[PDB]
Assembly symmetry: C2
Homo-oligomer: 123 residues x 2
């Protein structure tokens, strides 16, 4: 939205590890992605928090494995929305919208491609 | 979407009337929805413009009939993206995201349902 920036595309994925956390989400709600570089199992960890800031889970490890570099180097802004399945037991769907500057679009695309991902259309 | 607005959902439709207008859209790009209340063929008309303000076409008449009331009464903000098919000669896919004040949620859904529509998952 921010002027100077454009929608790049979207990805679909899942929040995992719900059984380990107590944070809850409603359908159609935004969630916050938050890097956790101190995670002692995965340096590329990305937590998913609800709008109140309580943790819900993590991005699946393959997806974090691609996105952590994009977050760390501020190559895009990534907004997550849970479209449905907010009451699921183990994993929850997540829709991610990517936006930013064109000077960074190639880098985002290359990072995703090198990890087997590809953006779909926005939002 | 700004606080305290919420996402209501999504709608998929088409931009029509492309053969009549000069405006070009790029694949995977935002468009502007603009009410055309003095359109003599349809008081409910909604123009679709590209990011320069040039008209590209119109929302299909059946969809405009549902959405004009929503726009005129400021019940939701509606954001349009053309996800693909931007090179189509006649009609072009359009993805609409709806957001607004949570107190308008019933009014939006009742208005859409009067015209045989409902929103899908956000965004
Ligand atoms: Na045209
Ligand atoms: Na025109």
């Amino acid at each position: 939205g921010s002027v100077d920036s454009v929608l790049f595309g979207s990805l679909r994925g899942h929040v995992v590890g719900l059984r380990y956390y107590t944070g809850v989400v409603n359908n159609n709600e935004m969630v916050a992605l938050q890097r956790d570089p101190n995670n002692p199992y995965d340096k590329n960890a990305i937590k998913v928090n609800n709008v109140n800031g309580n943790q819900v889970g993590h991005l699946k490890k393959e997806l974090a494995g691609a996105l952590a570099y994009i977050m760390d180097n501020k190559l895009a802004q990534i907004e997550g929305v849970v479209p449905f399945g907010a009451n699921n037991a183990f994993t929850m769907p997540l829709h991610m919208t990517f936006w930013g500057k064109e000077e960074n679009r190639k880098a985002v695309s290359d990072q995703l491609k090198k990890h087997g991902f590809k953006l779909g259309p926005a939002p």
